[PDB]
Coordinates of all heavy atoms in Angstrom, one line a residue:
Chain A
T1 N -26.3 9.2 16.5 CA -26.9 9.3 17.8 C -28.3 8.6 17.7 O -29.1 9.0 16.8 CB -27.1 10.7 18.2 OG1 -27.9 11.4 17.2 CG2 -25.8 11.5 18.5
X2 N -28.7 7.8 18.7 CA -30.1 7.4 19.0 C -30.4 6.0 18.4 O -29.9 5.1 18.9 CB -30.4 7.5 20.5
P3 N -31.2 5.9 17.3 CA -31.7 7.0 16.4 C -32.9 7.7 17.2 O -33.6 7.1 17.9 CB -32.2 6.3 15.2 CG -32.6 4.9 15.6 CD -31.5 4.6 16.7
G4 N -33.1 9.0 17.0 CA -32.4 9.9 16.1 C -31.4 10.8 16.8 O -31.2 10.8 18.0
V5 N -30.7 11.7 16.1 CA -29.8 12.8 16.7 C -28.8 12.3 17.7 O -28.9 12.6 18.9 CB -30.6 14.0 17.1 CG1 -31.2 14.8 15.9 CG2 -31.7 13.8 18.1
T7 N -26.7 5.2 15.4 CA -27.3 4.7 16.7 C -26.6 5.3 17.9 O -25.7 6.1 17.8 CB -27.2 3.2 16.8 OG1 -25.8 2.7 17.0 CG2 -27.8 2.4 15.6
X8 N -27.1 5.0 19.1 CA -26.5 5.1 20.4 C -26.1 6.5 20.7 O -26.9 7.3 21.0 CB -27.4 4.5 21.5
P9 N -24.8 6.9 20.7 CA -23.6 6.0 20.3 C -23.2 5.1 21.5 O -23.5 5.5 22.6 CB -22.5 7.0 20.0 CG -22.8 8.1 21.0 CD -24.3 8.2 21.0
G10 N -22.4 4.0 21.2 CA -22.2 3.5 19.9 C -23.3 2.6 19.4 O -24.2 2.3 20.2
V11 N -23.3 2.0 18.2 CA -24.3 1.0 17.8 C -25.7 1.6 17.8 O -26.6 1.0 18.4 CB -24.2 -0.3 18.7 CG1 -24.8 -1.5 18.0 CG2 -22.7 -0.7 19.0
Chain B
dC1 O5' -29.9 19.9 3.7 C5' -30.4 18.6 3.4 C4' -30.8 17.9 4.7 O4' -31.3 16.6 4.5 C3' -29.6 17.7 5.7 O3' -29.6 18.7 6.8 C2' -29.8 16.3 6.3 C1' -31.1 15.9 5.7 N1 -31.3 14.4 5.6 C2 -31.9 13.7 6.6 O2 -32.3 14.3 7.6 N3 -32.1 12.4 6.5 C4 -31.7 11.7 5.4 N4 -32.0 10.4 5.3 C5 -31.0 12.4 4.4 C6 -30.8 13.8 4.5
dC2 P -28.4 18.9 7.8 OP1 -28.7 20.2 8.5 OP2 -27.2 18.6 7.1 O5' -28.7 17.7 8.9 C5' -29.7 17.7 9.8 C4' -29.7 16.5 10.8 O4' -29.9 15.3 10.1 C3' -28.5 16.3 11.6 O3' -28.6 16.9 12.9 C2' -28.3 14.8 11.6 C1' -29.6 14.3 11.0 N1 -29.5 13.0 10.3 C2 -30.4 12.0 10.6 O2 -31.1 12.0 11.6 N3 -30.6 10.9 9.7 C4 -29.9 10.8 8.6 N4 -30.2 9.8 7.8 C5 -28.8 11.7 8.3 C6 -28.7 12.8 9.2
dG3 P -27.4 17.4 13.7 OP1 -28.0 18.2 14.9 OP2 -26.5 18.1 12.8 O5' -26.7 16.1 14.3 C5' -27.0 15.6 15.6 C4' -26.3 14.3 15.8 O4' -26.8 13.3 14.8 C3' -24.8 14.4 15.5 O3' -24.0 13.8 16.6 C2' -24.6 13.6 14.2 C1' -25.7 12.6 14.3 N9 -26.0 11.9 13.0 C8 -25.6 12.2 11.8 N7 -26.1 11.5 10.8 C5 -26.9 10.6 11.5 C6 -27.6 9.5 11.0 O6 -27.7 9.1 9.8 N1 -28.3 8.8 12.0 C2 -28.3 9.1 13.3 N2 -29.0 8.3 14.1 N3 -27.5 10.1 13.8 C4 -26.9 10.8 12.9
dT4 P -22.5 14.3 16.9 OP1 -22.5 15.6 17.6 OP2 -21.7 14.2 15.6 O5' -21.8 13.2 17.8 C5' -22.3 13.0 19.1 C4' -21.8 11.6 19.7 O4' -21.8 10.7 18.7 C3' -20.4 11.7 20.3 O3' -20.3 10.7 21.3 C2' -19.5 11.3 19.1 C1' -20.4 10.3 18.3 N1 -20.2 10.3 16.9 C2 -20.6 9.1 16.2 O2 -21.2 8.2 16.8 N3 -20.3 9.0 14.9 C4 -19.7 10.0 14.1 O4 -19.5 9.8 12.9 C5 -19.4 11.2 14.8 C7 -18.8 12.4 14.1 C6 -19.7 11.3 16.1
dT5 P -18.9 10.4 22.2 OP1 -19.2 10.2 23.6 OP2 -17.9 11.5 21.8 O5' -18.4 9.0 21.5 C5' -19.0 7.8 21.9 C4' -18.8 6.7 20.9 O4' -19.0 7.1 19.6 C3' -17.4 6.1 20.9 O3' -17.5 4.7 21.4 C2' -17.0 6.2 19.5 C1' -18.3 6.2 18.8 N1 -18.3 6.6 17.3 C2 -19.2 5.9 16.5 O2 -20.1 5.2 16.9 N3 -19.0 6.2 15.1 C4 -18.1 7.0 14.5 O4 -18.0 7.1 13.3 C5 -17.3 7.7 15.5 C7 -16.3 8.8 15.0 C6 -17.4 7.5 16.8
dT6 P -16.4 3.6 21.3 OP1 -16.6 2.6 22.3 OP2 -15.1 4.2 21.1 O5' -16.8 2.9 19.9 C5' -18.1 2.3 19.7 C4' -18.5 2.1 18.3 O4' -18.0 3.2 17.5 C3' -18.1 0.8 17.6 O3' -19.3 0.3 17.0 C2' -17.1 1.3 16.5 C1' -17.6 2.7 16.2 N1 -16.6 3.5 15.6 C2 -16.8 4.1 14.3 O2 -17.8 3.9 13.7 N3 -15.8 4.9 13.8 C4 -14.6 5.3 14.4 O4 -13.8 6.0 13.9 C5 -14.5 4.7 15.7 C7 -13.2 5.0 16.5 C6 -15.4 3.9 16.3
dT7 P -19.3 -1.1 16.1 OP1 -20.6 -1.8 16.3 OP2 -18.0 -1.8 16.3 O5' -19.2 -0.5 14.6 C5' -20.3 0.3 14.1 C4' -20.0 0.9 12.7 O4' -18.7 1.5 12.7 C3' -19.9 -0.1 11.5 O3' -20.9 0.3 10.6 C2' -18.5 0.1 10.9 C1' -18.2 1.5 11.4 N1 -16.8 2.0 11.3 C2 -16.4 2.9 10.4 O2 -17.2 3.3 9.5 N3 -15.2 3.5 10.6 C4 -14.2 3.1 11.5 O4 -13.1 3.7 11.5 C5 -14.6 2.1 12.4 C7 -13.7 1.6 13.5 C6 -15.9 1.5 12.3
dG8 P -21.7 -0.6 9.6 OP1 -21.5 -2.1 10.0 OP2 -21.6 -0.2 8.2 O5' -23.2 -0.2 10.1 C5' -23.9 -0.9 11.1 C4' -24.6 0.1 12.0 O4' -23.8 1.2 12.2 C3' -26.0 0.5 11.5 O3' -27.0 -0.2 12.2 C2' -26.0 2.0 11.9 C1' -24.7 2.3 12.7 N9 -24.0 3.6 12.4 C8 -23.5 4.0 11.2 N7 -22.7 5.0 11.2 C5 -22.7 5.3 12.6 C6 -22.0 6.3 13.3 O6 -21.2 7.2 12.8 N1 -22.3 6.3 14.7 C2 -23.1 5.5 15.3 N2 -23.3 5.6 16.6 N3 -23.8 4.5 14.6 C4 -23.6 4.5 13.3
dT9 P -28.3 -0.7 11.4 OP1 -28.9 -1.9 12.2 OP2 -28.0 -0.9 10.0 O5' -29.3 0.5 11.6 C5' -30.0 0.8 12.8 C4' -30.9 2.0 12.7 O4' -30.2 3.1 12.2 C3' -32.0 1.8 11.7 O3' -33.1 1.1 12.3 C2' -32.4 3.3 11.5 C1' -31.1 4.1 11.8 N1 -30.5 4.8 10.6 C2 -30.2 6.2 10.8 O2 -30.3 6.8 11.9 N3 -29.6 6.8 9.7 C4 -29.4 6.2 8.5 O4 -28.9 6.9 7.6 C5 -29.7 4.8 8.4 C7 -29.5 4.1 7.1 C6 -30.3 4.2 9.4
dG10 P -34.6 1.0 11.7 OP1 -35.2 -0.2 12.2 OP2 -34.5 1.3 10.2 O5' -35.3 2.3 12.4 C5' -35.5 2.3 13.8 C4' -35.9 3.7 14.2 O4' -35.0 4.7 13.6 C3' -37.3 4.2 13.9 O3' -37.7 5.1 15.0 C2' -37.1 4.9 12.6 C1' -35.7 5.5 12.8 N9 -35.0 5.8 11.5 C8 -35.0 5.1 10.3 N7 -34.2 5.7 9.4 C5 -33.6 6.7 10.1 C6 -32.7 7.7 9.6 O6 -32.2 7.8 8.4 N1 -32.4 8.7 10.5 C2 -32.9 8.7 11.8 N2 -32.5 9.7 12.6 N3 -33.7 7.8 12.3 C4 -34.1 6.8 11.3
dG11 P -39.0 5.9 14.9 OP1 -39.6 6.0 16.3 OP2 -39.9 5.5 13.8 O5' -38.4 7.4 14.5 C5' -37.6 8.1 15.4 C4' -37.2 9.4 14.8 O4' -36.4 9.2 13.7 C3' -38.3 10.3 14.4 O3' -38.2 11.6 15.0 C2' -38.1 10.5 12.9 C1' -36.6 10.3 12.8 N9 -36.2 9.9 11.4 C8 -36.6 8.9 10.6 N7 -36.0 8.9 9.4 C5 -35.2 10.0 9.5 C6 -34.3 10.5 8.5 O6 -34.0 10.0 7.4 N1 -33.7 11.7 8.8 C2 -33.9 12.3 10.0 N2 -33.3 13.5 10.2 N3 -34.7 11.8 11.0 C4 -35.3 10.7 10.6

DNA sequence: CCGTTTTGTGG
């Protein structure tokens, strides 16, 4: 996720 | 050590 907590996706 | 959709990053 994110960053933080990538994306999603990417 | 964290975190869902795609196979990854600054926090």
Side-chain angles (χ1 to χ4, degrees):
Chain A
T1 58
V5 294
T7 72
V11 201

